[PDB]
Write a protein that binds this ligand. Structure first.
Ligand SMILES: Cc1cc2nc3c(=O)[nH]c(=O)nc-3n(C[C@H](O)[C@H](O)[C@H](O)COP(=O)(O)O)c2cc1C
Lengths: 49, 97
């Protein structure tokens, strides 16, 4: 019972969830970094205050 | 992301299920109810809600039942075909009790 659009996304076998999601996010990481914007140093990922 | 993470190593889907999922390539357009496109099919559920399925024997049996369900005489007309369809799936019809 998968979705019709994302079945074509599945390509290989037994790829760990961590690597899969890391690549998912790294796509946007590279897309944003292509604009030439350096990152800023932050203590953690939440940064609520 | 739900679908892209099915064939993951930590997932408990059957290895044959994982291989079949990798093999099938779906469509980008909408799929009409009860029809199949690009190895992908859309059929109704037990309560009538629509479902997305891969085009396999179980999906074919489900679509046939959707074609048939709703009339006892319709079930009686094509009973043996329905028996064979279930016998092809993993939830087969019991014997003639
Ligand atoms: C096999 C499967 C089971 C799902 N079960 C639920 C569910 O129980 N409850 C829910 O709210 N969404 C459920 N979803 C939908 C997901 O929340 C999510 O919208 C979907 O996996 C995204 O599909 P996509 O990878 O094609 O973008 C399910 C999706 C799939 C593929």
């Amino acid at each position: 019972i998968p979705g019709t659009a994302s079945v074509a996304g599945i390509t290989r076998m037994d790829e760990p969830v961590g690597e899969l999601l890391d690549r998912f996010e790294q796509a946007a990481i590279d897309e944003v970094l292509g604009a030439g914007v350096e990152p800023k140093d932050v203590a953690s990922r939440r940064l609520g205050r | 992301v739900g679908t892209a993470a099915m064939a993951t190593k930590e997932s408990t889907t059957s290895p044959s299920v994982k291989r079949m999922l990798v093999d099938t390539q779906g469509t980008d357009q909408w799929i009409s109810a009860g029809k199949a496109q690009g190895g992908m099919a859309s059929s109704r559920s037990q309560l009538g809600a629509d479902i997305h399925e891969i085009d396999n024997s179980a999906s074919r049996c489900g679509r046939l039942l959707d074609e048939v369900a709703g009339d006892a005489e319709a079930v009686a007309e094509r009973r043996d075909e329905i028996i064979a369809a279930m016998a092809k799936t993993a939830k087969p019809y019991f014997g003639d009790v």
